[model samples]
Target: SFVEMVDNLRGKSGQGYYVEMTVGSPPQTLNILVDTGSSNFAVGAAPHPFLHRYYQRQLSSTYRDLRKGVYVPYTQGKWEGELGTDLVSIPHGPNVTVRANIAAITESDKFFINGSNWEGILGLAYAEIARPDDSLEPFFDSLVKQTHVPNLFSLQLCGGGSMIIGGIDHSLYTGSLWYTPIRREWYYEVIIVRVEINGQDLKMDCKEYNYDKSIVDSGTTNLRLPKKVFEAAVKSIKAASSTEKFPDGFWLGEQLVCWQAGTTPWNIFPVISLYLMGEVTNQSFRITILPQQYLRPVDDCYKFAISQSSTGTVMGAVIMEGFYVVFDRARKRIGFAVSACHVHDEFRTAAVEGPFVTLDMEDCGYN
Candidate 1:
């Protein structure tokens, strides 16, 4: 039965993971990111008058044009689209045919558009991209409530590995869950506890920080701290390095910067915790907050920790190693627990190399 469940949870092509959904009368295919960090399901739509050619070609035949439905704006710009009902297929059980909507708009450089990889992102957090009248329920919300399927979903973002759905991977689920308060924003956001390295809590002005809209994303791999916080973190690492003069950010053979500074070599791991509704949740869910040394040197400094390439600080699948994260869309909440299993160190090491390297080695390796 576990084997059968695994088979069903596996992606359709036996390659990258995907979720099937029918938009309107026609069926469509989308890549599910299980992004607890974001709250919108964005897909590559067919070429519109305003769309860029690069993004237009990424859509599956089932993607519908929603120009007639709604207009949604981002901090960067505005997006126009509509809602349609579609049948969705995941790896497990029966395919779900549900009423979901998609955004149809001009090209956004931030969008990922590889034909062989995911066509677009299916956001699982609690939020809607559509307007009040046209707002469609979140796909996962519908999956749990209407389908009577498992109320919870989990992600273990180990590198170069398959994303499991419908069931938990014994190697990944730790049986402990960390619950945090949900933000009132489109997705659940929580306050962050101070970042620690080598057992030393990095001194920070909590007044200068904000985690009200922070996302715990499985699709993103690294921690994306605010500019001020990021600067403080880098400074601490620089001070901790044995060599007084540090190269922008690189491992010069034997130096190490623990997530918590000043802790024993064994205790020097990064620890990030969230305070939910003034109460701390998931304090036990620990992830390695990497130092600047892990980055490659270019000219003077390591590239900004939070990628400036994208609009938002993407907390991709990397930080999710050794954790089982849950997205409860109906209740508009998120939960985390330490994973019983260790994500292969190989994956964690590769993720530290950044998305481009990870994609080249993992997603595009065969081709």
Candidate 2:
């Protein structure tokens, strides 16, 4: 079933993951990043316009160009395109389709293009953050409400694994999924009790620090933490791994910087955990990240998990790759469990032809 997943393990989109969406009446194929950070579906904004195919809205019979310009930005880059609506489909189950706001990105910045393999972004965030002028409902949300379809989506990626929409495949994960009650729907955001290593809390005053937040974002390529915590985490990593600090230079051959080289990080880096809480309980649940899931590779070197992003600290792809992450809209909660990391045709074994699990619209717990 996952092999039916449009794109392959080509590992494009800045070494991140991409999803396939059939756009328009004639249905043009779209290979865009599967971003949970923003809510905009667009293509054709690369520096070299001819590198990828641009959606020909003029040819679609259901095309209705809103004639307004829209530009959506991720932490990595931005996209600028004509605002419009079209018949778009995920092509997974029952071929769920909707007339949602789609963009034809005519102009793109370098970061959005990223030299060669740049294509587009498909935002899986909220309808709230979409362009106010053309605040069209997201395809997944529309599918659930309009089609009474299941409101479930999970991403487990590494060199391009799979984006399972419509329902869950019980076979993909091992342990029971830990449900973290959401504090914000826009980002699958949750309240973190604190961050730590070897039982040492990141900040000296755990209160001010624990009184913090984070988003589980698949869109971002790097994991970012507050400066003090990040620095401390690096120290813990060094002590645990018995690794000396690396020189200030390119990480192996890639652009990313590394503090260690020529060592097996997966067996060395300590487990990083986040305690998440809900309104009714004080017993917070946890998301355990292995070093294999935290330390990113750049050939012979490894980059630390933490980066220097602004207020938005997140658990990005590197951390997410080790788990089956579930965003449950009906329950107003998010779920995670250790992914078996099923690969290639092996993932297809879980596929089945049947109706997805569903419930009545009013039964949704979130407001």
Candidate 3:
């Protein structure tokens, strides 16, 4: 398997992790965000105030413009571009160079924000989520179709972790993989059975956990819970920890909790867990994250990395960084195992366990 070891940028797990890849012929290199949440292979083809550089289509000998306009609007940013095909390759990626589709972004809004280090985004989700339509194949699908590599890929987000294409590297994880059905293909959607705070249940209708439909998105910076679920979680965290009198500003995004420069308040925070429904009927698994992950440090103060999602729950980098995530397309399932990046101790940052029996619940995913 070709393992792409990314130079996890400073603030590593905070913003997002990116990988260096080359596009067109006589290749132009750019740092691309590996977003599992999106499916358009786009690059900055036009100059924007925030971008350091952009792709010069006229300069690439192998660039082919398909003359199709493509537009994608994100929760935070949006862009429009011309769809085309080009010879694309990744450093330490697949063994063969594949001609892949590319969206040369000519106009954009906040897609490339100020202080952003990456020049483009490479979406890894299935074609179903591809813009314009599913007729366009995603980068990974194109790569897999042209190579003898396995139809699965894996990610380890710590140390900037490694995104291994074609197959799994057993060494990046501990213990056996716990598989969960990919209830839907658009966003690596899965059914979350329930949630817990400091080992106590958040207590809500099972369907609420999958409100709008839960997804595992590497592109998102925080772990997002449904609005109702988020409120309950915050309440539970306060009850389970020593932060009862904490101001609303902390949870409302108006303030950060700071402590003595050399000290931390991790002890007063709670451990969070998400129980995901497995492939077998009534089977489920639990992935836990300690305060160290959710209460991420921001300069001198620590910021709460978990947020309220008006949509479905999102297991973002806050949760992904805790395990080795495998996107097994061929089997139509996603797998999670203990990430090698996690240290084992009372102060352990993450944990994963499963095959537990689940209460009979409604189908928490789309048809």
The C-alpha lDDT values of all candidates are 0.43, 0.61, 0.81
Q: Which 10-residue span in candidate 2 carries the lowest summed lDDT?
A: 346-355
**What does candidate 3's lDDT look like per residue over 151-232, in tens digits?**
9878888726788877788778898789898887898988888788878887788788888889989888888888988899
Top candidate (TM-score)? 3
Order of the predicted models by TM-score, top scorer first: 3, 2, 1
Model 2's TM-score against the true structure: 0.81
The model with the greatest lDDT is 3
Question: Which residue pairs in candidate 2 have backbone atoms (N, alpha carbon, C) closer than 3 angstroms, thus clashing?
Answer: 1-348
TM-score of each: 0.62, 0.81, 0.94
RMSD of 3: 2.0
- Clashes in model 3: which pairs? none
Off by over 4 Å in 3: 1-11, 343-349
Q: Model 2, range 1-367, lDDT digits (tens) per residue?
A: 4445422323532356776667788888766667787777777733354355657877789999787887776666665778878887766434567777777787766545444343666778777777543256765666677775577777777636667775566676776777767666776666566566754656433333222446778876666665555556666766776754454332121344444455344555566766555324344556656655455655355555456544545777876776777787778887777677722221122111111122221122222
Clashes per prediction? 33, 1, 0
